[PDB]
């Protein structure tokens, strides 16, 4: 039926110069040695990504799909969604969102400057007036960092990002922001994945697993998911949006954005040249995450019905899916998964690695992460979220004239606090660096490092400071990632941690509380860690 993209043959070009690694990486050359292995995707590889995501889709739906979609619209019809004022939409624009072609950017939009508001008013007018003319978009290579992997072909090519002008992006929110905030929860319930913190994600997967008499689980890796979303899926999304109770102006806007932007359009490079034409999901529109989550969910739940998955409990996150169900025995479970893959493939959601059933929760990886287990201070099993530390370590070593990795370190320390790699490696390094810089109470992206113990207790529980006897998989993977990146082994981080702990303790105050709580693992004579009052008086509902 339809190709995902066409190409004029024009280069996908950068926005200015993309920047060289340097000969010394002073913040990270004591963390790891093999800096040669750390790389950033650039436009030089955009052409190669284009090839991998340009292909034919044909889609065949069926009674199971139709039934799931019908249930979903009924669930949607219980939502009431308001327009946002132009001004509210403007205030929701992020601080460094890409500037508009019409002589203004994020700062002007967020201060409701006159010409910004004027332009947006006219953009919105035209959305109400013209429900047809395709809206132009810019195509760019994303710049992301990874560690080279010879197993899987050296260096990944850059992902492509496709987006309309800042004015339009503001309009999208006027039409759809309230929906983006209400629909997934309304349509999917506990299955909507973005509502959970790591600890909660673990709790959900564990309750799901315990509820089945003989559980089986799998993840579904979907290949270039954005490229496999069809016009029809996109129009079916509009149709789900339109099931909700909406003002009429919203409807026209939503319909018009659907037909003019979402469904597809032409793509221009940064130098202005016509680059191609798109008939799939754009990465850089407001509905991307919501859309992918909803469509992935419909397709997947239909596939479960097609394939005979019994009593399924799902967790969905854009293109990432995990399903835990009642096993029918291995021979059948293998059969049903093959049926699932066949159904998804028919629905235009074909797999990357084909799925496989598992009967141990540590062996299921989704959102690049998995559940593992360790023991707590009183001897009890403690489950937590973890992941391969390779890419976090590579990004911990990305250091240029224009980028500092310290933030990235902190993101991982918080999200993955209970892991052995965060506790023994990243935490040891982060504090060591800040101490020597004497910047231990700077403010990183809104967080004050000396509050970590509070924050971690709130997010992960006090047991995060007292876990031991990590799993074989985890010990193996962490040892192996350190070796792969030429970082010191754990043995050495332990010495470094003893030293970092001492200096923290010796400065008293919140620093010493960090030393005591965060590095209790590093000393023979364990202190008894008690709840932190500063932690009760703290609400991080905001972040998840
Ligand atoms: Cl315990």
Description:
The structure is a monomer. The protein is of the alpha+beta class and 544 residues long. It has two domains: 1-368, no CATH class; 369-544, no CATH class. 45% of the residues lie in helices and 12% in strands. It contains 20 helices and 14 strands. It has helices at 46-53, 63-76, 86-91, 106-110, 114-129, 166-188, 198-210, 225-228, 231-243, 248-262, 288-307, 330-346, 390-396, 406-415, 420-437, 452-460, 472-485, 490-506, 509-518, 533-536; strands at 2-3, 5-7, 38-40, 56-57, 137-141, 145-147, 160-163, 215-220, 265-268, 274-278, 310-317, 320-326, 370-375, 381-386. The strands form five sheets. A five-stranded mixed beta sheet has the order 2-10-9-5-7. It has a three-stranded antiparallel beta sheet with strand order 8-12-11, with helices on both faces. It has a two-stranded antiparallel ribbon with strand order 1-4. Strand 13 (370-375) and strand 14 (381-386) form a beta hairpin. Helix 2 (63-76) crosses helix 11 (288-307) and helix 18 (490-506) packs antiparallel against helix 19 (509-518). The radius of gyration is 25 Å and the shape is globular. The structure holds chloride ion. Residues 376-380 line the site of chloride ion. The PDB classes it as transferase. The entry lists the keywords HCV, viral, NS5B, rdrp, resistance mutation, delta8 beta hairpin loop deletion, Transferase. It forms a monomeric assembly.
């Amino acid at each position: 039926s339809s190709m995902s993209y066409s190409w004029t043959g024009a280069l996908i070009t950068p926005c200015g110069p993309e920047e060289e690694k340097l000969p010394i990486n002073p913040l990270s050359n004591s963390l790891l040695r093999y800096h040669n292995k750390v790389y950033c995707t650039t436009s030089k590889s955009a052409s190669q990504r284009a090839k991998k995501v340009t292909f034919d889709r044909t889609q065949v739906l069926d009674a199971h799909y139709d039934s799931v979609l019908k249930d979903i619209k009924l669930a949607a019809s219980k939502v009431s969604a308001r327009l946002l004022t132009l001004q509210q939409a403007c205030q929701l624009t992020p601080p460094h969102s890409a500037r508009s072609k019409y002589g203004f950017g994020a700062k002007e939009v967020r201060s409701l400057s006159g010409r910004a508001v004027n332009h947006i008013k006219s953009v919105w007018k035209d959305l109400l007036e013209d429900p047809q003319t395709p809206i132009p978009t810019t195509i760019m290579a994303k710049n992301e960092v990874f560690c080279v992997d010879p197993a899987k072909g050296g260096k990944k090519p850059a992902r492509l990002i496709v987006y309309p002008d800042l004015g339009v992006r503001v309009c999208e929110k006027m039409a759809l922001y309230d929906i983006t905030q209400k629909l997934p929860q309304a349509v999917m319930g506990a299955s909507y994945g973005f509502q959970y913190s790591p600890a909660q994600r673990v709790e959900y997967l564990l309750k799901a697993w315990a509820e089945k008499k003989d559980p089986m689980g799998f993840s579904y890796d979907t290949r270039h998911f954005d490229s496999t979303v069809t016009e029809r899926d996109i129009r079916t999304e509009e149709s789900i949006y339109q099931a909700c109770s909406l003002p009429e102006e919203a409807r026209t806007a939503i319909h018009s954005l659907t037909e003019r932007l979402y469904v597809g359009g032409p793509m221009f490079n940064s130098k202005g040249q016509t680059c191609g034409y798109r008939r799939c999901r754009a990465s850089g529109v407001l509905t991307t995450s919501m859309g992918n989550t909803i469509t992935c969910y419909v397709k997947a739940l239909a596939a479960c019905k097609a394939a005979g998955i019994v009593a399924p409990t799902m967790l969905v996150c854009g293109d990432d899916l995990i399903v835990i169900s009642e096993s029918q025995g291995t021979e059948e479970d293998e059969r049903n998964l093959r049926a699932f893959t066949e159904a998804m493939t028919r629905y235009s959601a074909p797999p990357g690695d084909p799925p496989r059933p598992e009967y141990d929760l540590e062996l299921i990886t989704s959102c690049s992460s998995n559940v593992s287990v360790a023991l707590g201070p009183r001897g009890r099993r403690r489950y937590y979220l973890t992941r391969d530390p390779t890419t976090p370590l590579a990004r911990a070593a990305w250091e240029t004239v224009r980028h500092s990795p310290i933030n990235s370190w902190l993101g991982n320390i918080i999200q993955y606090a209970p892991t052995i790699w965060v506790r023994m490696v990243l935490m040891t390094h982060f504090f060591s660096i800040l101490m020597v810089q004497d910047t231990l109470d700077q403010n990183l992206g809104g967080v004050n490092p000396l509050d970590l113990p509070a924050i971690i207790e709130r997010l992960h529980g006090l047991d995060a400071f007292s876990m031991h006897t990590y799993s074989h998989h985890e010990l193996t993977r962490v040892a192996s990632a350190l070796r792969k990146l030429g970082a010191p082994p754990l043995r050495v981080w332990k010495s470094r941690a003893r030293a970092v702990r001492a200096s923290l303790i010796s400065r008293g105050g919140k620093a010493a509380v960090c030393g005591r709580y965060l590095f209790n693992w590093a000393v023979k004579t364990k202190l008894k860690l008690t709840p932190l009052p500063e932690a009760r008086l703290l609400d991080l509902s905001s972040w998840f």
